[PDB]
Design an enzyme around this catalytic site. Structure first.
Site, PDB file in Angstrom:
ATOM      1  N   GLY A 149       0.785  -1.211   0.045  1.00  9.98           N
ATOM      2  CA  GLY A 149       0.033   0.113  -0.092  1.00  9.98           C
ATOM      3  C   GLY A 149       0.904   1.298  -0.060  1.00  9.98           C
ATOM      4  O   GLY A 149       0.574   2.282   0.557  1.00  9.98           O
ATOM      5  N   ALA A 150       2.185   0.873  -0.490  1.00  7.36           N
ATOM      6  CA  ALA A 150       3.044   2.124  -0.541  1.00  7.36           C
ATOM      7  C   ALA A 150       2.643   3.588  -1.077  1.00  7.36           C
ATOM      8  O   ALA A 150       3.003   4.493  -0.416  1.00  7.36           O
ATOM      9  CB  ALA A 150       4.117   1.857  -1.398  1.00  7.36           C
ATOM     10  N   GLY A 193      -0.393   5.122  -0.569  1.00  7.72           N
ATOM     11  CA  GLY A 193      -1.266   5.550   0.418  1.00  7.72           C
ATOM     12  C   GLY A 193      -0.511   6.523   1.488  1.00  7.72           C
ATOM     13  O   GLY A 193       0.615   6.776   1.534  1.00  7.72           O
ATOM     14  N   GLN A 194      -1.482   7.077   2.399  1.00  6.68           N
ATOM     15  CA  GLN A 194      -0.906   8.012   3.296  1.00  6.68           C
ATOM     16  C   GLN A 194       0.292   7.356   4.151  1.00  6.68           C
ATOM     17  O   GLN A 194       1.182   8.070   4.479  1.00  6.68           O
ATOM     18  CB  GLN A 194      -2.071   8.449   4.202  1.00  6.68           C
ATOM     19  CG  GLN A 194      -3.320   9.378   3.411  1.00  6.68           C
ATOM     20  CD  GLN A 194      -4.079  10.190   4.495  1.00  6.68           C
ATOM     21  OE1 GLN A 194      -4.113  11.507   4.301  1.00  6.68           O
ATOM     22  NE2 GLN A 194      -4.617   9.501   5.563  1.00  6.68           N
ATOM     23  N   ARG A 254     -18.252  -7.559   9.680  1.00  9.75           N
ATOM     24  CA  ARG A 254     -16.636  -8.023  10.251  1.00  9.75           C
ATOM     25  C   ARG A 254     -16.501  -9.168   9.512  1.00  9.75           C
ATOM     26  O   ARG A 254     -15.391  -9.402   9.091  1.00  9.75           O
ATOM     27  CB  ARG A 254     -16.469  -7.806  11.596  1.00  9.75           C
ATOM     28  CG  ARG A 254     -15.106  -8.068  11.964  1.00  9.75           C
ATOM     29  CD  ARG A 254     -14.747  -7.378  13.279  1.00  9.75           C
ATOM     30  NE  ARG A 254     -13.429  -7.662  13.744  1.00  9.75           N
ATOM     31  CZ  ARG A 254     -12.314  -6.990  13.505  1.00  9.75           C
ATOM     32  NH1 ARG A 254     -12.568  -5.728  12.897  1.00  9.75           N
ATOM     33  NH2 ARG A 254     -11.130  -7.266  13.917  1.00  9.75           N
ATOM     34  N   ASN A 284      -9.969 -10.383   3.297  1.00 14.44           N
ATOM     35  CA  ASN A 284      -8.528 -10.130   3.628  1.00 14.44           C
ATOM     36  C   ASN A 284      -7.857 -11.492   3.771  1.00 14.44           C
ATOM     37  O   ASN A 284      -6.721 -11.492   3.393  1.00 14.44           O
ATOM     38  CB  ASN A 284      -8.405  -9.322   4.851  1.00 14.44           C
ATOM     39  CG  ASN A 284      -8.685  -7.776   4.507  1.00 14.44           C
ATOM     40  OD1 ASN A 284      -7.831  -7.247   4.008  1.00 14.44           O
ATOM     41  ND2 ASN A 284      -9.882  -7.243   4.849  1.00 14.44           N
ATOM     42  N   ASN A 339      -5.879  -3.900   8.507  1.00 17.72           N
ATOM     43  CA  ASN A 339      -6.869  -4.441   9.208  1.00 17.72           C
ATOM     44  C   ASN A 339      -7.752  -5.594   8.643  1.00 17.72           C
ATOM     45  O   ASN A 339      -7.700  -5.464   7.421  1.00 17.72           O
ATOM     46  CB  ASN A 339      -7.848  -3.583   9.705  1.00 17.72           C
ATOM     47  CG  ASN A 339      -8.724  -3.725  10.972  1.00 17.72           C
ATOM     48  OD1 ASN A 339      -8.261  -3.660  12.053  1.00 17.72           O
ATOM     49  ND2 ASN A 339     -10.263  -3.728  10.822  1.00 17.72           N
ATOM     50  N   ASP A 365      -2.217   1.846  19.852  1.00 18.92           N
ATOM     51  CA  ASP A 365      -3.263   1.763  20.960  1.00 18.92           C
ATOM     52  C   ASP A 365      -2.564   2.157  22.227  1.00 18.92           C
ATOM     53  O   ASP A 365      -3.128   2.647  23.124  1.00 18.92           O
ATOM     54  CB  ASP A 365      -3.998   0.617  20.897  1.00 18.92           C
ATOM     55  CG  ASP A 365      -4.430   0.122  19.444  1.00 18.92           C
ATOM     56  OD1 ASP A 365      -3.912  -0.464  18.769  1.00 18.92           O
ATOM     57  OD2 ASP A 365      -5.715   0.765  19.179  1.00 18.92           O
ATOM     58  N   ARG A 424      -1.593   5.762  22.409  1.00 24.90           N
ATOM     59  CA  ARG A 424      -2.982   6.540  22.862  1.00 24.90           C
ATOM     60  C   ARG A 424      -3.245   6.494  24.283  1.00 24.90           C
ATOM     61  O   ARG A 424      -3.679   7.242  25.047  1.00 24.90           O
ATOM     62  CB  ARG A 424      -3.939   6.088  22.013  1.00 24.90           C
ATOM     63  CG  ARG A 424      -3.775   6.318  20.606  1.00 24.90           C
ATOM     64  CD  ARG A 424      -5.219   5.811  19.522  1.00 24.90           C
ATOM     65  NE  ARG A 424      -5.493   6.161  18.279  1.00 24.90           N
ATOM     66  CZ  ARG A 424      -5.817   5.671  17.220  1.00 24.90           C
ATOM     67  NH1 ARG A 424      -6.486   4.300  17.602  1.00 24.90           N
ATOM     68  NH2 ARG A 424      -5.898   6.036  16.210  1.00 24.90           N
ATOM     69  N   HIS A 430      -7.284  -6.495  18.085  1.00 27.08           N
ATOM     70  CA  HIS A 430      -7.778  -5.223  17.998  1.00 27.08           C
ATOM     71  C   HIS A 430      -9.450  -5.292  17.954  1.00 27.08           C
ATOM     72  O   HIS A 430     -10.083  -6.516  18.182  1.00 27.08           O
ATOM     73  CB  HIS A 430      -7.248  -4.634  16.580  1.00 27.08           C
ATOM     74  CG  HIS A 430      -6.310  -3.777  16.860  1.00 27.08           C
ATOM     75  ND1 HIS A 430      -4.839  -4.072  16.262  1.00 27.08           N
ATOM     76  CD2 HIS A 430      -6.169  -2.702  17.414  1.00 27.08           C
ATOM     77  CE1 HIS A 430      -4.313  -2.990  16.642  1.00 27.08           C
ATOM     78  NE2 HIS A 430      -5.093  -2.305  17.323  1.00 27.08           N
TER      79      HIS A 430
HETATM   80  N1  LIG Z   1      -2.846  -1.509  13.003  1.00 29.66           N
HETATM   81  C1  LIG Z   1      -3.085  -0.192  13.169  1.00 29.66           C
HETATM   82  O1  LIG Z   1      -2.442   0.305  14.292  1.00 29.66           O
HETATM   83  C2  LIG Z   1      -3.582   0.681  12.218  1.00 29.66           C
HETATM   84  C3  LIG Z   1      -3.736   0.061  10.902  1.00 29.66           C
HETATM   85  N2  LIG Z   1      -4.237   0.853   9.921  1.00 29.66           N
HETATM   86  C4  LIG Z   1      -4.324   0.167   8.551  1.00 29.66           C
HETATM   87  O2  LIG Z   1      -3.706   0.888   7.603  1.00 29.66           O
HETATM   88  C5  LIG Z   1      -4.255   0.631   6.375  1.00 29.66           C
HETATM   89  C6  LIG Z   1      -4.212   1.864   5.232  1.00 29.66           C
HETATM   90  O3  LIG Z   1      -3.803   2.994   5.657  1.00 29.66           O
HETATM   91  P1  LIG Z   1      -3.447   3.942   4.709  1.00 29.66           P
HETATM   92  O4  LIG Z   1      -2.158   3.667   3.960  1.00 29.66           O
HETATM   93  O5  LIG Z   1      -3.466   5.506   5.424  1.00 29.66           O
HETATM   94  O6  LIG Z   1      -4.537   4.334   3.839  1.00 29.66           O
HETATM   95  P2  LIG Z   1      -4.955   4.792   2.155  1.00 29.66           P
HETATM   96  O7  LIG Z   1      -6.200   4.485   1.695  1.00 29.66           O
HETATM   97  O8  LIG Z   1      -4.309   6.043   2.174  1.00 29.66           O
HETATM   98  O9  LIG Z   1      -3.854   4.171   1.147  1.00 29.66           O
HETATM   99  C7  LIG Z   1      -4.013   2.187   1.101  1.00 29.66           C
HETATM  100  C8  LIG Z   1      -3.129   1.898   0.332  1.00 29.66           C
HETATM  101  O10 LIG Z   1      -3.300   0.361  -0.055  1.00 29.66           O
HETATM  102  C9  LIG Z   1      -3.182   0.185  -1.323  1.00 29.66           C
HETATM  103  N3  LIG Z   1      -3.857  -1.209  -1.634  1.00 29.66           N
HETATM  104  C10 LIG Z   1      -4.997  -1.728  -1.529  1.00 29.66           C
HETATM  105  N4  LIG Z   1      -5.095  -3.098  -1.618  1.00 29.66           N
HETATM  106  C11 LIG Z   1      -3.690  -3.446  -2.059  1.00 29.66           C
HETATM  107  C12 LIG Z   1      -2.946  -4.589  -2.528  1.00 29.66           C
HETATM  108  N5  LIG Z   1      -3.630  -5.776  -2.631  1.00 29.66           N
HETATM  109  N6  LIG Z   1      -1.764  -4.667  -2.626  1.00 29.66           N
HETATM  110  C13 LIG Z   1      -1.126  -3.533  -2.428  1.00 29.66           C
HETATM  111  N7  LIG Z   1      -1.738  -2.396  -2.244  1.00 29.66           N
HETATM  112  C14 LIG Z   1      -3.140  -2.147  -1.997  1.00 29.66           C
HETATM  113  C15 LIG Z   1      -3.972   1.314  -1.997  1.00 29.66           C
HETATM  114  O11 LIG Z   1      -4.126   1.391  -3.430  1.00 29.66           O
HETATM  115  C16 LIG Z   1      -3.551   2.416  -1.218  1.00 29.66           C
HETATM  116  O12 LIG Z   1      -2.642   3.049  -1.837  1.00 29.66           O
HETATM  117  C17 LIG Z   1      -5.735   0.520   6.445  1.00 29.66           C
HETATM  118  O13 LIG Z   1      -6.248  -0.311   5.609  1.00 29.66           O
HETATM  119  C18 LIG Z   1      -5.861   0.184   7.859  1.00 29.66           C
HETATM  120  O14 LIG Z   1      -6.363  -1.195   7.998  1.00 29.66           O
HETATM  121  C19 LIG Z   1      -4.782   2.036   9.992  1.00 29.66           C
HETATM  122  C20 LIG Z   1      -4.679   2.802  11.259  1.00 29.66           C
HETATM  123  C21 LIG Z   1      -3.932   1.943  12.464  1.00 29.66           C
END
Ligand SMILES: NC(=O)C1=CN([C@@H]2O[C@H](COP(=O)(O)OP(=O)(O)OC[C@H]3O[C@@H](n4cnc5c(N)ncnc54)[C@H](O)[C@@H]3O)[C@@H](O)[C@H]2O)C=CC1
Ligand SMILES: NC(=O)C1=CN([C@@H]2O[C@H](COP(=O)(O)OP(=O)(O)OC[C@H]3O[C@@H](n4cnc5c(N)ncnc54)[C@H](O)[C@@H]3O)[C@@H](O)[C@H]2O)C=CC1
Lengths: 337, 335
Positions: free
Chosen positions: B10-11, B13-14, B96, B103, B129, B157, B160, B185
């Site tokens: 997911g490189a 992404g944010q 869920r 996934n 997740n 967590d 936080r 979680h």
């Molecule tokens: N464990 C924790 O403490 C936390 C985990 N997260 C997880 O982080 C994840 C992503 O957050 P962000 O990067 O900010 O989201 P985002 O929506 O900005 O970007 C996610 C990226 O993942 C990519 N993606 C989707 N399916 C894919 C696949 N099969 N292979 C490769 N890339 C793929 C998308 O194209 C996107 O660029 C969320 O899905 C969430 O599950 C978020 C907050 C806390």
């Protein structure tokens, strides 16, 4: 020790978001704690709150505290350094002269806030565009501060140039030396390769002795110049992480000194008797180092050939012209009152 | 030293955006160079390209190079660690069970890619997740790897929790000790304050002895629970900087060891004979430290009162349930 107080303006934007976290992580002030002053405008305050929540959720040991605010007094009071990121963007139909004009008021007001409330030792890094001119205006209107308190950010462009050249030559960035960005930002910026050397296979040569003249004195500035646009094209937004990296790099060097052989391009008030024939009165990017006392010095010994002379003279002329526009705009508003 | 090869899924992404830069700045592997493997999906190619241009424009001395790709093999080849950020998001109208199911396929496939192409010493941190269950599924489908290769992120967590309790007590975060996040979680996560102490005016006291019962056993968990939501409401997007911070913290500890007295919550495959009566077979957040060889250990000596016993058993049951859903879905696909 008491925590260092650090101001970030436009704190709720892309750059502020990254910059605040990076600083709170300990990267700027080392073992010393930091207290963040986070300034933005009322429309942005929800985003600003979201930022503080994430800062909080990092449980940063270096973060002594913070204030998120729209109030200048709260933002500038007793600060040790400042990242002036906020500026007024170009509106549709406006040209550069209008950009300079709109921002002159912001930076006049900011200079006044700095002088009234910041510590006399405050180190002010101007990032918002047009940065050289915004810096000159802020300085001119900061009556209790001095030239040594102010600089503008040109390191993003230097870092772009280093990567471009290293890639072209097929070496690491650490093996390239003495690339310099001189003068103003914008179209008149001088991306100078005439001093530059590189090491490849234990052999050190000058860059301009190896690369085609066409590349050096045409293609190169072109790629550098359209880089930001190319990122916006693909990203959908302008750069954020890379100017932040450059900003932290500039301030950290400014605070604690540069390393042996290191040369960082920095916009500074032109020193009288600088060795490159630049007239005092503007903020101009020079090759710089910084001593352990945190004082910036222009690096001596670089050579100015006819090409570089003409480019330096042109960007110098450009900067004085921008200053003229900014001061005239302020004078006209004053007169109208 | 040769460069450490670091995968981020997911490189584009944010999280990926910030994580890649932070790692390239040298904050993870110290003096050692890193070589980033940046994976995302076809529609994100342009954003991925933009990311690489900015990485380039930092002139990072720690960045040996990178691969930025949609191809699994290129992304997983000879990697030393991985931040598995990407996951299938919940689609409108799904529950869920659907999230777990969708996934499971992705993480089965990821487990297979890891086993086939990654180094046998690869350290895999699961972030996307549902992370505990995603981690379990990837591990189960990583033939040539072992439980030691896998963990999941619970440190966001914990962080936080520390700031919430410190703020409530009016002390510095450094003056609060032994807060732990246990289990899964989601709803069943155990934000445990029953071990926790704080220092003030030369006295050390238990948090549960000073704070109100209603706060500790109701208000506090609600605050932690609606934090992500509350950030989303204000930011317009989900958290990014704070999970990145926790992810680097977790991986850095895993790489070099934790500091004296340091207790980090980490999701790990349950160790047989752990001292807290949790059953092997899932990935479960424990209080951990990490030794100098980079091996994770559950910290001993914490107490389990009746309240904590019940919470631990509930989240344990929850995890085995999620696992069952995931495995049943994958089984359905086989036949
Ligand atoms: N464990 C924790 O403490 C936390 C985990 N997260 C997880 O982080 C994840 C992503 O957050 P962000 O990067 O900010 O989201 P985002 O929506 O900005 O970007 C996610 C990226 O993942 C990519 N993606 C989707 N399916 C894919 C696949 N099969 N292979 C490769 N890339 C793929 C998308 O194209 C996107 O660029 C969320 O899905 C969430 O599950 C978020 C907050 C806390
Ligand atoms: N010199 C350099 O190397 C570079 C400089 N920049 C400058 O950085 C600026 C910010 O970039 P981003 O963070 O991406 O923009 P952004 O649009 O994401 O954020 C800008 C922030 O400034 C705030 N703001 C506007 N007027 C303000 C005022 N009077 N006081 C305080 N805050 C105010 C906005 O509310 C917003 O939160 C750009 O406008 C540009 O001028 C950008 C790239 C490179």
């Amino acid at each position: 020790s008491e925590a260092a107080h650090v101001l970030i303006t436009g704190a709720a934007g892309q750059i502020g978001y990254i910059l605040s976290h990076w600083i709170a992580s300990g990267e700027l002030y080392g073992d010393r704690q930091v207290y963040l002053h986070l300034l933005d405008i009322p429309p942005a305050m929800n985003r600003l709150t979201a930022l503080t929540m994430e800062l909080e959720d990092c449980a940063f040991p270096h973060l002594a505290g913070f204030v998120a605010t729209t109030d200048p007094k709260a933002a500038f009071k007793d600060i040790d350094c400042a990242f002036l990121v906020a500026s007024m963007p170009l509106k549709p139909g406006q040209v550069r002269a209008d950009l300079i004009s709109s921002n002159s008021v912001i930076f006049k007001n900011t200079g006044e806030y700095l002088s009234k409330w910041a510590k006399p030792s405050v180190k002010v890094l101007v990032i918002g565009n047009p940065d050289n001119t915004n810096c000159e205006i802020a300085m001119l209107h900061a009556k209790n501060l001095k030239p040594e308190n102010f600089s503008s950010l040109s390191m993003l462009d230097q870092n772009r140039a280093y990567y471009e050249v290293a890639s072209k030559l097929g070496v690491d960035v650490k093996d390239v030396h003495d690339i310099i960005v001189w003068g103003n930002h914008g179209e008149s910026m001088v991306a100078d390769l005439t001093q530059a050397t590189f090491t490849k296979e234990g052999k050190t040569q000058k860059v301009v002795d190896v690369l085609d003249h066409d590349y050096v004195f045409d293609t190169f500035f072109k790629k550098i110049g359209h880089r930001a646009w190319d990122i916006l094209e693909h990203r959908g937004f302008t750069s954020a992480a890379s100017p932040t990296k450059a900003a932290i790099q500039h301030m950290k060097a400014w605070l604690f000194g540069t390393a042996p052989g290191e040369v960082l391009s920095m916009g500074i008030p032109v020193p009288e008797g600088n060795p490159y024939g630049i007239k005092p009165g503007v903020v101009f990017s020079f090759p710089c180092n910084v001593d352990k006392e945190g004082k910036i010095h222009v690096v001596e010994g670089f050579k100015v050939n006819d090409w570089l002379r003409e480019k330096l003279d042109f960007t110098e002329k450009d900067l004085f012209h921008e200053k003229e526009i900014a001061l005239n705009h302020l004078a006209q508003l004053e007169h109208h009152h």
